[PDB]
């Protein structure tokens, strides 16, 4: 059906325009869903080399569309600040080992040096799917209030595959085509600024914006 009609309706060989593609993605509208669309950029890097990995984040003016349980698992000043800053819980070891198994999961996890219990409380399951606090990502910092403020402001994080293609949360289809621009360009600018100095050759070749249920198109 859709997989056999959209294939002939939209051609991925021709490189579309930003304005045409943002409209076409919303124009597909085959199945009914929240339609949380995303992107995929083919970075020119050697992910084989450890230093050319690009794990980072950027604060977006549209966030992700949903709030998570961004709590600071470090008892003390950071946890006290986060509790009033609007986390999902407080920082304690009752939910790290005795509750780390019973409790299913949260959205995010920040850390502080006051009680670095979360460094082992997650163990293998808590951060096995990407829940550990990145020291370079800023999650594990003393400023629990600042971390909670950034999490409320909507700092979206991105990583790399084993070949160097970045895909990450960018926003829902409920945000208009005009609003898509200050998300796409903001993410691209942040990635360009944070690009490693050891990036030989052309480091951006192909941007493809895709739907959760639909396909993807070559934007530029």
């Amino acid at each position: 059906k859709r997989m056999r009609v959209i294939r002939e309706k939209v051609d991925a060989t021709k490189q579309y325009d930003i304005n045409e593609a943002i409209a076409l993605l919303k124009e597909l509208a085959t199945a009914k869903f929240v339609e949380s669309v995303d992107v995929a950029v083919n970075l020119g890097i050697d992910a084989r080399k450890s230093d050319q990995n690009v794990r980072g984040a950027t604060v977006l003016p549209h966030g992700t569309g949903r709030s998570v349980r961004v709590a600071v698992f470090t008892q003390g000043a950071n946890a006290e600040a986060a509790k009033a800053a609007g986390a999902e819980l407080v920082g304690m070891e009752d939910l790290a080992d005795q509750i780390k198994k019973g409790e299913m999961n949260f959205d995010v996890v920040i850390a502080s040096p006051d009680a670095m219990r979360v460094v082992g409380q997650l163990g293998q399951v808590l951060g096995p799917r990407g829940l550990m606090p990145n020291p370079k990502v800023g999650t594990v910092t003393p400023n629990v209030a600042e971390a909670v403020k950034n999490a409320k402001a909507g700092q979206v994080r991105y990583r790399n595959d084993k070949n160097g293609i970045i895909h990450t949360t960018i926003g829902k289809v409920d945000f208009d085509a005009d609003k898509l621009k200050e998300n796409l360009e903001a993410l691209l600018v942040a990635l360009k600024k944070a690009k490693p100095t050891q990036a030989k050759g052309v480091y951006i070749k192909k941007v493809s914006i895709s739907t959760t249920m639909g396909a993807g198109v070559a934007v530029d």
Binding site: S112, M116, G127, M132, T139, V140, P142
Partner: protein, 228 residues
Amino acid sequence: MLVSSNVTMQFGSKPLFENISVKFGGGNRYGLIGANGSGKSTFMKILGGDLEPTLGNVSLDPNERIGKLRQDQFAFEEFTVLDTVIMGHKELWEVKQERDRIYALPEMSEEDGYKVADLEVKYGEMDGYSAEARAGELLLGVGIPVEQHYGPMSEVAPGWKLRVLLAQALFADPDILLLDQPTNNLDIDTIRWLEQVLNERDSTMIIISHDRHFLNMVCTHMADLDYG
């Protein structure tokens, strides 16, 4: 391709091998021969980079994970059967041993918070979530069943100690330098299992065995190290 550039080593008061230089690279298997007491294992250590020569340079490959087998099949007797294989990969084993200083140190500092935050991330990059998942399956593939995975290495017959020490080198392995692989002499069934394993997979290898028939059936070159 790893290259030796005028390598000399002087043990005692007379040079062992004088100003050697040769190129290793490709899907070939440079088995090397030499009388005991004359280079061989020392040259293998130089190539691996564990020991530096008195003159010359290793001219190492950039990050191609030299995977090695040692001469001693009894040097591992306290680390368990499932511990040796996971310790084969350096950057994983070192990070694991350092991260093991969390549950054993009841005091954490501000810098230590950053360090525990980033070492777990490095562990995730190095696949610590599957570090023990990728080891038991290889250990079963070589022919070591489950019942002795967590048992100590001491309670293993040496013909299987070698079977596990070989698997210790099988973690994303180009450029495997195998020291004396026989000794603790394999039956011959284990020897043919070895030869099929070695000559089926494609990589650059350096054998040092003394078995003429095994070397005939395996290797294509002979990097003899005899006179100087």
